[PDB]
């Protein structure tokens, strides 16, 4: 069994060692290789692309199979960010939770999904900015889901063009270190690094979290 | 009552332990066979069994 | 293993001792020191893991 290292590999959203290719779009599956390298094409109506695969790795798909986005071509674990950019956040949450619970239940430990789910929501709670429009934001900037959500909400009422963005998934470490409260990250780790950017931005803790209050 | 210059530093047996005394070791500086650390007059070591 | 490194520290304790003073007559009594060895032995038995 993959055990605890798998659980950490999930909670940290790390790249799987077994990492399996997934269809970026919904095409038809076309298996093509002369004997050198194994290639698998997935082609929609006007689009197309292929996936370079080692001959040894066993796939799950048959030639002429109509597939969808995020659907795995090869067996093994799937890179969380890949299906984040393929299917969407929902399917992500589903996969993460189901895998963590997979390991746990396999070890014979029963727990309610809610626990895992909170953490999972904490993971993708950040987004990346693309074409900020009428907002002070810049391309590539990263900020919480709720923040940009409200920004767009008010931007619509102002008549101004909202902010296009993309969901951003990250591990518990990189998540917690990215939190609004600077006291939280300072308490956590990367202290020397955190306090620098904190002081530079002159960020101001509202004592929303309980741990930054534990300090106080 | 006048509080004299000198006061009581006496070593009292710590709580959670105590009993009889099987032995006492007295070493004062200036005594034969014993060199005591600089600036220190006496050292007393009690064995409590 | 400690004796040798201590004796090496003393070995260089001899070097700078040779290049000064009176090169004419110095008995090995003046050329030898306690410290670079004795301290190296004292550091071992007490503080070695």
């Amino acid at each position: 069994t993959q055990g605890l290292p798998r659980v950490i590999e999930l909670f940290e959203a790390r790249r799987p060692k077994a990492k399996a290719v997934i269809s970026e779009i919904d095409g038809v599956v076309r298996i093509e290789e002369g004997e050198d390298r194994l290639s698998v094409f997935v082609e929609s109506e006007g689009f197309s692309k292929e996936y370079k695969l080692p001959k040894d790795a066993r796939l799950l798909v048959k030639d002429g199979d109509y597939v969808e986005a995020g659907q795995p071509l090869t067996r093994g674990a799937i890179d969380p960010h890949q299906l984040l950019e393929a299917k969407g956040p929902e399917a992500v949450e589903r996969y993460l939770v189901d895998e963590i619970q997979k390991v746990y239940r396999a070890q014979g430990v029963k727990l309610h999904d809610k626990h895992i789910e909170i953490v999972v929501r904490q993971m993708l709670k950040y987004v990346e900015v693309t074409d900020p429009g009428d907002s002070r934001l810049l391309e590539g900037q990263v900020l919480e889901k709720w923040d940009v959500e409200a920004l767009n909400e008010r931007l619509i009422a102002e008549g101004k063009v909202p902010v296009a963005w993309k969901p951003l998934l990250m591990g518990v470490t990189k998540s917690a270190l990215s939190t609004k409260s600077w006291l939280s990250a300072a308490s956590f780790q990367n202290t020397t690094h955190v306090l620098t950017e904190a002081a530079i931005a002159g960020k101001k803790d509202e004592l929303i979290g309980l741990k930054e209050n534990v300090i106080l | 009552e006048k509080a004299r210059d000198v006061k009581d530093t006496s070593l009292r047996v710590p709580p959670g332990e105590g009993g009889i005394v099987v032995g006492r070791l007295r070493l004062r500086r200036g005594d034969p066979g014993v060199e005591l650390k600089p600036g220190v007059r006496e050292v007393v070591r009690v064995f409590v069994a | 293993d400690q004796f040798r490194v201590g004796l090496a520290r003393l070995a260089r304790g001899v070097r700078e001792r040779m290049v000064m003073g009176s090169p004419d007559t110095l008995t090995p009594a003046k050329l030898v020191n306690s410290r670079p060895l004795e301290a190296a032995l004292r550091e071992f038995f007490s503080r070695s893991q």
Partner: protein, 347 residues
């Protein structure tokens, strides 16, 4: 990984050594410059070091020397520029001694830099002190400067001698002024050195370490066991609170040190209870004597009041106040033996 020592080593490696010719020329140009300053002092009626530093202001950089001596040393436009203008009023024979001066001033720098390669080699046998490599070498070079200013080439002595004597000093002073965390004046360091020296000698001989009797015996007159033991006690240096513990790398030192310089929570309510119960037991005394007591022991203005003062505002004589506080004291002594409330606090 950017070594600070190789930096200085290759920095002094850029300027070559100096043979007899260059050395003599340097020193001569220097003394010529200084005596030039001596005549220029009679020129405008100024001092030596005044014009001497004014020269530096125009050589080793302009604004930078007067800009950061620290917040106040000497004004740039006022006590400096006027010295430049005042010496600009002079003819050939005079005005040339200025160029001679500054020339000598540069020669001094060249001299110090040329012999730096020595000073660096001097502080290498001096390592293992309370100061590291660069820290030692620099404080040696400080000695090189004074070794320069006081040097005379006319005595036909290679500067490598007169300099080395000043470096060997400057470092051995630099240790006396830094060394241990606590400051130890020179003489103490000296006596300590003599002591450890004697120790090293008779321990080499006897085949074992001395005693305060024999070590002070070998120290000469006035030296007894108590004194050598005393200076030995002062010899030791403080211990860091970051000192590790045993096998555990995590365990520190200072976490074992209690704070007794701050009142314990028990002591707060202790002193409170005393100050309260005392005030309660005080109210059983006459309006005068009760006040007189706390005026005498400083429970009022926080200071003792002499009988003269306690009687001054009461109009009564000192003797009266005395008898008053005695009587009142024993009248308290009656109630206290009864209640047994304040019979505590006996330490």
């Amino acid at each position: 990984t950017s070594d600070p020592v190789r930096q200085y080593l290759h920095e002094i490696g850029q300027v070559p050594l100096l043979t007899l010719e260059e050395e003599i020329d340097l020193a001569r140009k220097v003394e010529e410059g200084m005596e030039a300053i001596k005549k220029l002092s009679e020129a405008t009626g100024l001092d030596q070091e005044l014009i001497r530093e004014v020269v530096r202001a125009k050589i080793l950089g302009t604004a930078r020397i007067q800009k950061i001596p620290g917040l106040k040393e000497k004004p740039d436009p006022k006590t400096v520029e006027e010295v430049d203008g005042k010496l600009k009023s002079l003819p050939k024979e005079l005005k040339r001694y200025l160029h001679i001066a500054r020339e000598g001033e540069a020669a001094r720098q060249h001299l110090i830099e040329a012999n730096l390669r020595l000073v660096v080699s001097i502080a290498k046998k001096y390592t293992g002190r309370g100061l590291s490599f660069l820290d030692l070498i620099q404080e040696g070079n400080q000695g090189l400067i004074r070794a320069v200013e006081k040097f005379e080439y006319k005595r036909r002595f290679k500067f490598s001698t007169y300099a080395t004597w000043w470096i060997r000093q400057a470092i051995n002073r630099a240790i006396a002024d830094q060394a241990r965390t606590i400051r130890i004046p020179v003489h103490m360091v000296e006596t300590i050195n003599k002591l450890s020296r004697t120790a090293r000698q008779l321990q080499q001989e006897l085949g074992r370490e001395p005693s305060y009797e024999e070590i002070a015996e070998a120290m000469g007159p006035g030296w007894d066991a108590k004194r050598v033991e005393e200076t030995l006690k002062i010899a030791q240096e403080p211990v860091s609170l970051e000192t590790p513990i045993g096998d555990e790398k995590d365990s520190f030192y200072g976490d074992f040190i209690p704070d007794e310089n701050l009142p314990s929570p028990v002591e707060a309510a202790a002193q409170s209870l005393l100050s309260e119960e005392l005030e309660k037991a005080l109210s059983k005394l006459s309006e005068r004597e009760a006040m007189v007591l706390k005026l005498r022991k400083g429970l009022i203005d926080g200071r003792e009041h002499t009988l003269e003062e306690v009687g001054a505002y009461f109009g009564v004589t000192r003797e009266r106040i005395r008898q008053i506080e005695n009587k009142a004291l024993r009248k308290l002594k009656y109630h206290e033996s009864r209640t047994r409330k304040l019979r505590d606090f006996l330490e």
